[PDB]
Amino acid sequence: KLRRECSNPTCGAGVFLANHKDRLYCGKCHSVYKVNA
RNA sequence: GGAUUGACAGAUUGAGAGCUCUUUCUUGAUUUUGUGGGUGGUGGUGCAUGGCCGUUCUUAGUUGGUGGAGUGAUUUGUCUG
Numbered sequence: 001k002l003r004r005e006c007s008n009p010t011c012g013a014g015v016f017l018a019n020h021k022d023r024l025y026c027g028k029c030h031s032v033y034k035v036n037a
Numbered sequence: 038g039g040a041u042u043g044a045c046a047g048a049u050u051g052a053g054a055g056c057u058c059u060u061u062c063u064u065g066a067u068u069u070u071g072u073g074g075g076u077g078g079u080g081g082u083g084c085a086u087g088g089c090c091g092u093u094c095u096u097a098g099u100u101g102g103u104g105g106a107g108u109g110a111u112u113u114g115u116c117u118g
C-alpha cells in the first residue's frame with residue numbers, strides 16, 4: 001500500500017501522512033506530531 | 038472515496054491568530070445553511086409597566102362611627118383664644 005503509515009504512539013501505525021514540503025503531517029492530533037522528514 | 042473541524046512550513050494579521058490561500062492528513066455524524074424558534078443586547082421604550090428612591094413637607098396634616106345642616110354636591114366634629 002502507498003500513502004505512508006505513521007509512527008504514531010497514539011495509534012496502531014495506521015494514520016496516513018500529509019506529505020508537504022518537509023512534512024509528514026499527522027492529522028490524528030490537532031497540531032502536534034509533526035515528525036519532519 | 039466527507040456536516041461541523043484542527044494545524045505546522047509560509048504571503049497572513051498586531052500577534053509564536055490558520056482566519057483567508059499553496060496546503061493534506063484526520064481530530065467527525067452533534068442541525069454545517071433557510072424556515073420554524075429560543076437567548077442576548079449596557080438597544081429605544083420608568084410616556085406601557087414591579088419594587089425602590091426622591092419631592093410635595095418639619096410646615097403639621099388626615100379620617101371613618103352615629104348624630105345636626107341642606108336635596109344633592111358637600112360639610113359640622115376638624116373653631117372665637
Ligand SMILES: [Zn+2]
Binds near residue numbers: 008024026033034
Ligand atoms: Zn505525527
